[PDB]
Each structure stands twice: as C-alpha cells, then as structure tokens.
Write a protein that binds this ligand. Structure first.
Ligand SMILES: Nc1ncnc2c1ncn2[C@@H]1O[C@H](C[C@@H](N)CC[C@H](N)C(=O)O)[C@@H](O)[C@H]1O
Length: 325
C-alpha cells in the first residue's frame, strides 16, 4: 500500500515562507510528497524517497514521526516505541517541564532495556509539544548552525560590502531545487556567496560578474573552499551561455542606494528577465534578491513565492522564487 513516512520539520523562525518552501522544493525534487501541513514553526510531511535533510538551511531539526498524541498520552506511545541496542536520550521542545518529562520518558525507556545517557546519545527521541499535541519520533537531522557562522563573508580571502550571508545563500540555491551534478548560475556573483553554498552541496557552480577584479576575487574564494567551478567576466544582460543550459539561477541584484536612482535599474531587470528565461531549462527556477518590487519585470515567469526580510528601516529585501512556465 502506502509507502510514505511522516516527517516533522522544525523550522527556523527567521523566515517561515523561505523555510516551508525550501523543504517543499527539495522534497519534490528528491522524492514524492503524499501530503503536507504547516502550523507556525512546524511542517509535517508525508514523504517517500531520498533524504535531502543535510542540505537544509532554514530547518533546525528533522524528526521521523512514530505517532502524534496528547500531552497526557505520552506514556502509552513510549511503551510501544521501538527500542534499539544503541545509546539514547529523550529531548522535549516547547511548553514547560521539558527537563523533568525528558528524565521521566527516559526512565520509562530504561525499564524496557534501552541504554540511556544524555551526554553522547547515538539515537535521540524527540517530543514536539504544540497546542496540546505531541509529535513523537526519532531525530534524523539537526542543523549545525555554526557551519554558516564559520562561512560568513568576512572569513573569506576576498571581501566585498553587503555580501549575502551563507544561511540565506544556501536556502536560495535550495529553492531552485538544483541537484548534485547540475548547474547553478549566479549571473552577478560578486564574492561568490551562492556559488560557494552550491559548490559545497555538490552542485556545479557558474558565476558571471562584469568587474574583472571581482571575477578574480570570486575565483580565489571558490579555490579557498576547494570548489571546482567557472567564474567568467560578462554581463548578466548578455549571458555567454546557450539556451536552456542551466537548471537554476540564484542571485542578489544591485540595490538602489537612494530614491534619486529610481528607474536606473529598469534595463537590468528587463534584460536579465529575458536572459534568465532563455538560459534556464524548461520548468527551471530563479531565486532572486532585490531591494525593490520587480514583479512586473518578471511577468514572463511564474512567481512561486515572494517574501520580505526587513533588515533595517532603510532596507527591505524582496525575495522571489521564479519558475519558467
Ligand atoms: N549587469 C551585471 N552583470 C554582471 N555583473 C554585474 C552586473 N551588475 C552588477 N554586477 C556585479 O554584481 C555584484 C554585486 C551584486 N551581486 C549585488 C550585491 C548587493 N545587493 C549590492 O547592491 O551591492 C558586483 O560584484 C558587480 O560587479
């Protein structure tokens, strides 16, 4: 019969629209989504196929669900939950009494002959408590948040102001749904934030930049991370690429620094819109970052998602996921 398994995704509060979309794009590329449901920081997925979890940037934790029950029904599910000869512990998230209930459910498991220690568990039982509903399962993935810190743009040999941060850079590459061995293009690559995240996930990156010094510097950064890719001198308005040659596009557009510069970027948006549609494979995606509303320039695409990230009172990033019809 049914081959899907229930998985819980505990999402980063940073941006729930990016967080939900990321999971859904990758699940649809790696496997088959039977159903999905979202409630605040929780995303429940009935899914089959290849696990894509280690690529996630806006998901904090992924748990394989055994059962969903009430806060009063936790002792019944823990009496039937499968036991393994490997070291385990219980970890509760949300509500109050976390520490006491972990010790309580851990004791119940210890009575059934389970090896339980908090320090170095091999297996972690997770309890997500929300609206008097308990999501019980086994931890599959926990995002190492330090990874993104250690790759911050200021830690790379080549530095430029306002470079996209690795967590957002990885999530945007992920939103294109590009796979290992496929090509991700950043046509205004700069320091290479997007190319680095793509490269590290085994995607073949290609960057284009119209400043030679920046092309050189981006190449240095890719070399620094041991990434094999191509950084070319060129203009995003006139891509040195064939029609339908790339699976995905992830880019940060230039930002208008002043309202006195309104309209200066019109040809850039119109021409890159045309160029992106041309080079993207059929059903291909472009994850783009702007500081202005540009929906109208991309009317030739499907606008799958549009979100905002208010950084400060002067800058609101518009994040779009565009798909070729
Ligand atoms: N038309 C273009 N073709 C290729 N590279 C470009 C073009 N316009 C800008 N760039 C490059 O894009 C990079 C910066 C952009 N990714 C935008 C970053 C940031 N949002 C900013 O406004 O500065 C720089 O390295 C530029 O050289």
């Amino acid at each position: 019969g049914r081959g899907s398994m229930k998985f819980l995704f505990y999402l980063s509060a940073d941006n729930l629209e990016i967080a939900r979309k990321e999971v859904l794009v990758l699940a649809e590329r790696y496997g088959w989504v039977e159903d999905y449901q979202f409630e605040e920081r929780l995303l429940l997925l009935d899914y089959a196929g290849e696990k894509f979890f280690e690529r996630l940037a806006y998901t904090n934790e992924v748990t394989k669900i055994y059962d969903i029950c009430s806060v009063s029904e936790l002792e019944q599910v823990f009496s039937e939950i499968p036991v393994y000869d490997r070291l385990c512990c219980v970890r509760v998230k949300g509500g109050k009494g976390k520490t006491a209930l972990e010790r309580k459910l851990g004791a119940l498991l210890w009575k059934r002959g389970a090896k339980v220690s908090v320090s170095n568990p091999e297996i972690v039982y997770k309890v997500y408590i929300q609206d008097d509903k308990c999501y019980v399962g086994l931890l599959e993935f926990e995002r190492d948040t330090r990874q993104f810190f250690l790759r911050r743009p200021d830690r790379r040999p080549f530095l430029m102001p306002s470079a996209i941060k690795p967590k957002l850079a990885r999530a945007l590459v992920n939103l294109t749904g590009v796979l290992e061995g496929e090509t991700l293009l950043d046509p205004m690559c700069g320091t290479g934030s997007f190319l680095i995240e793509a490269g590290l996930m085994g995607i073949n990156p290609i960057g284009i930049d119209f400043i030679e010094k920046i092309v050189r510097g981006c190449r240095v950064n890719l070399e620094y991370y041991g990434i094999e890719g191509s950084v070319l001198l060129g203009d995003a308005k006139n891509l040195p690429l064939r029609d339908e040659s790339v699976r995905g596009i992830a880019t940060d557009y230039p930002y208008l620094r002043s309202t006195k510069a309104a309209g200066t970027l019109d040809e850039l948006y119109s021409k890159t819109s045309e160029e992106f549609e041309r080079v993207l494979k059929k059903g291909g995606r472009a994850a783009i970052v702007t500081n202005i509303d540009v929906e109208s320039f991309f009317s030739n695409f499907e606008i799958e998602m549009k979100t905002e990230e208010r950084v400060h009172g002067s800058l609101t990033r518009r994040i779009y996921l565009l798909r070729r019809h």
